[PDB]
Design a protein around this nucleic acid. Structure first.
Ligand SMILES: [Mg+2]
Ligand SMILES: [Mg+2]
Ligand SMILES: [Mg+2]
Ligand SMILES: [Mg+2]
Ligand SMILES: [Mg+2]
Ligand SMILES: [Mg+2]
Ligand SMILES: [Mg+2]
Ligand SMILES: [Mg+2]
Ligand SMILES: [Mg+2]
Ligand SMILES: [Mg+2]
Ligand SMILES: [Mg+2]
Ligand SMILES: [Mg+2]
Ligand SMILES: [Mg+2]
Ligand SMILES: [Mg+2]
Lengths: 116, 208, 49, 137, 85
RNA sequence: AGAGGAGACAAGUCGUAACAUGGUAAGUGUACUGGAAAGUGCACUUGGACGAACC
RNA sequence: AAACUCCAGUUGACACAAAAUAGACUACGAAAGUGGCUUUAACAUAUCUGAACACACAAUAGCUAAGACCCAAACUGGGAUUAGAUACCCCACUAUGCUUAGCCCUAAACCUCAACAGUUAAAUCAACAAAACUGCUCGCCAGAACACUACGAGCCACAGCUUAAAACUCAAA
């Protein structure tokens, strides 16, 4: 962990400040939400193969059946994988813990930046 | 809906209930035992257990229906199937023995194959970006694909370009043309495919 | 409606040792169930809801 | 032996070969992936140009050039030309972090060229020239 | 002026170009080259650079401390031992 | 005494510069430019933010 | 779109420009500032405060004179956008940024937190901010706006900088 001694601008700190945070460097009792990953267009390569075969075969499906089937299978796999990814996000196995359970854990042991 | 969420859609399939118990898996056995305790919706009047039932043709008839006139839509559908069969019989008789084997005469097979041929593979979605609208190519689900085929067939048959030609005759002609991979509907599918191929560079604009 | 009796005598001393919890009945029930669980630890459906 | 991600060193005896050719002799596929374009040039180990293909040379224009699809098409074209010239395995050297940085590589693989190594040659000055001013968006 | 095919080079294993490119990108990311290129696309004025560095250092401190606390408390995520009391 | 400036009076006119990421973050010095608020270059400031474990 | 196609890609030769990573270090300097390498010289004061009446410095910008000029870039020109666009977006180029010799002496020059010595005891403490204080000294402040203004004076500065008012007005700021 990087040192904080003599970094912030404080009384008794002779040097000019190193860090100028816009928020206090105090741990919050919550973590950020499970940020979604912006979806990218999928099955582009199979679509390209199918379209190139269409261009070579004058958009005749009979000749291109194999590539068309490959593109369709890739599209179905992508849709089913999106559904499975939603299921996995609900499960939370990939991460060490879901943000909700982590927020509960931090609620159980809150930060104490004050005296009592 | 007047049905509470407990209600389940009925399953109309004689073979599903005549299946021997031994063949049933533990999952199927559990499902069958569970279904004895659920509530079941009344069987819709559209579909029955008749061996001559075709969900595809029933859906096409419903899509052809105007103002809840299912009698007329069903009449148009059966007239179309009869016209397809009669034209195929005429071609079969008028053709040589070699061509008789290749000629198809089942109207149901012709209808299904025509719809399958008319099915588009890649669709276009209008996406807003930078203040403009782009026709981004996208994959299509099988449901939307079949619906697009049916709707294109019906819309082409309803076009004003055909003058004083009854719906059964127009629909039969279009079905035969599509079965042979020709006609305005197949041209519409080809135009959609060509536009998608042209806009392929915009495929990355899609976020799903 | 069923009414709970007065919870303390003339002297003011409440009858139940869990009176000051404010939920003496519920907490007494929880206490008894936890004690039963401890006893069971020490020793070691369709028609109902 | 164990596979090593480090490339073999010229002047050292290495048992690794590709069609009987040493790592120093495998042709080089330079992929400049700019933010608006992707150019792929195949050259021999002796620095003899063999093929060239960019998103512009594939009929893509304006913003369409700076896409993964255009880079993949350029990679396919370049790989086809290189295979016509007799190239099978290539050392890939990519410079730039454009959209076509990876897809172009895929095109080469779709074209029929086997990538034996991948190298990044993105020009990173040690605080040399001063780049243009920041955009306001 | 240096030798070539030594720096930023990753050998492909059995044609697994995807994994080779992933490893190369991971190397560049860990060494910080990718962020350096992205920041060097347009000139970052010295005041802006100092502000970004201060923000990133504070973010690193906070993230490391939060990770330390999470790891410290993760053992307490176990089942409730005094359930019902 | 022709004029300039400030304040008040407060209109109408031309824009919308500032206050929210004010829709190009704001501001200081300085230079140039513009009907006008203002724009841009260079350095500086937070009297902005960067969402604050990993993803 | 304009622009360039004596253009782009590889390889080799290639600088009076700027100094990735180290740097998650917090150091040097009075401040301004200083983060490539080597060498030379070198970082005042064996009490403290103290000059706006002086002396010496002072980022960037700017002026003067001679050079360098990769790249960037006010202005300008073109393209685009827009109701207009004297801007934001794109392209090209100049003053300028660099070197040397003089000037100019200004910054949100702010860590808006003076130097030195000391305390954490309490009666801690308007609010926020970066806890509350004590002794000593210097500098500064005394409603807002007029006003980083006018006049006077000083300056290598001549559309400048420093010091800096008053009148009219308001019950606020
Ligand atoms: Mg505005
Ligand atoms: Mg603004
Ligand atoms: Mg500004
Ligand atoms: Mg201008
Ligand atoms: Mg002194
Ligand atoms: Mg100066
Ligand atoms: Mg110049
Ligand atoms: Mg230039
Ligand atoms: Mg410009
Ligand atoms: Mg220099
Ligand atoms: Mg400063
Ligand atoms: Mg001033
Ligand atoms: Mg003055
Ligand atoms: Mg004067």
């Amino acid at each position: 962990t990087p040192s904080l001694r003599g970094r912030l601008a404080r009384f008794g700190n002779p040097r000019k400040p190193v860090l100028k945070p816009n928020k206090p460097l105090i741990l919050a009792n919550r973590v950020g939400e499970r940020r979604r990953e912006k979806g990218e267009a999928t099955c582009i390569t199979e679509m390209s193969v199918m379209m190139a075969c269409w261009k070579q075969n004058e958009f005749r499906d009979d000749a291109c059946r194999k590539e068309i089937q490959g593109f369709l299978d890739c599209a179905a796999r992508a849709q089913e994988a999106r559904k499975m990814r939603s299921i996995q996000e609900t499960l939370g196995e990939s991460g060490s813990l879901l943000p909700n359970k982590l927020n509960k854990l931090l609620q159980r042991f809150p930060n104490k930046p004050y005296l009592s | 809906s007047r049905y509470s969420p407990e209600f389940k859609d009925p399953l109309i399939d004689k073979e599903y209930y005549r299946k021997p118990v031994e063949e049933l898996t533990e999952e199927e056995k559990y499902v069958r035992e569970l279904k004895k305790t659920q509530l079941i919706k009344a069987a819709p009047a559209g579909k029955t257990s008749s061996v001559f039932e075709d969900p595809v043709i029933s859906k096409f008839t419903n899509m052809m229906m105007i103002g809840g006139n299912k009698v007329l839509a069903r009449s148009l559908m059966i007239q179309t199937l009869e016209a397809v069969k009669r034209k195929q019989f005429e071609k079969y008789h008028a053709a040589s023995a070699e061509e008789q084997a290749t000629i198809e005469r089942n109207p149901y097979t012709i209808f299904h194959q025509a719809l399958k041929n008319c099915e588009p593979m890649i669709g276009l979605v209008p996406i807003l970006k930078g203040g403009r609208f782009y026709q981004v190519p996208v994959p299509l689900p099988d449901r939307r694909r079949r619906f697009l085929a049916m709707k294109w067939m019906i819309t082409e048959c309803r076009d004003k370009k055909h003058q004083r030609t009854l719906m059964p005759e127009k629909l039969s002609h279009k079905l035969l043309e599509a079965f042979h991979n020709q006609g305005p509907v197949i041209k519409r599918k080809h135009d959609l495919h060509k536009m998608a191929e042209a806009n392929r560079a915009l495929a990355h604009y899609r976020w799903w | 409606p069923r009414q709970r009796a007065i919870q303390w005598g003339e002297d003011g001393r409440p009858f139940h040792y869990l009176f000051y919890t404010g939920k003496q009945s519920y907490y007494s029930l929880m206490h008894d169930v936890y004690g039963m669980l401890l006893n069971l630890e020490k020793h070691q459906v369709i028609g109902s809801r | 032996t164990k596979f090593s991600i480090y490339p073999p060193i010229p002047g050292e005896e290495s048992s690794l070969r590709w069609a009987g050719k040493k790592f120093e002799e495998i042709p080089i596929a330079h992929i400049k992936a700019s933010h608006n374009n992707t150019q792929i040039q195949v050259v021999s180990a002796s620095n003899e140009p063999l093929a060239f293909a960019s998103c512009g040379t594939e009929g893509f224009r304006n913003a369409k050039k700076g896409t993964g699809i255009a880079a993949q098409t350029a990679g396919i074209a370049a790989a086809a030309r290189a295979k016509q010239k007799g190239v099978i395995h290539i050392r890939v050297v990519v410079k730039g972090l454009g959209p076509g940085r990876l897809s172009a590589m895929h095109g080469l693989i779709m074209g029929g060229l086997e990538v034996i190594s991948i190298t990044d040659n993105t020009p990173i000055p040690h605080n040399g020239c001063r780049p243009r001013k920041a955009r306001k968006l | 002026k240096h030798l070539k095919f030594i720096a930023r080079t990753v050998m492909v294993q059995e044609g697994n170009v995807e994994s080779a490119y992933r490893t190369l990108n991971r190397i560049l990311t860990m060494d910080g080259l990718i962020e350096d290129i992205k920041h060097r696309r347009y000139y970052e004025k010295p005041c802006r650079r100092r502000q970004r560095e201060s923000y990133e250092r504070c973010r690193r401190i906070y993230n490391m401390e939060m990770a330390r606390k999470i790891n410290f408390l993760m053992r307490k995520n176990r089942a409730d031992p005094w359930q019902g009391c």
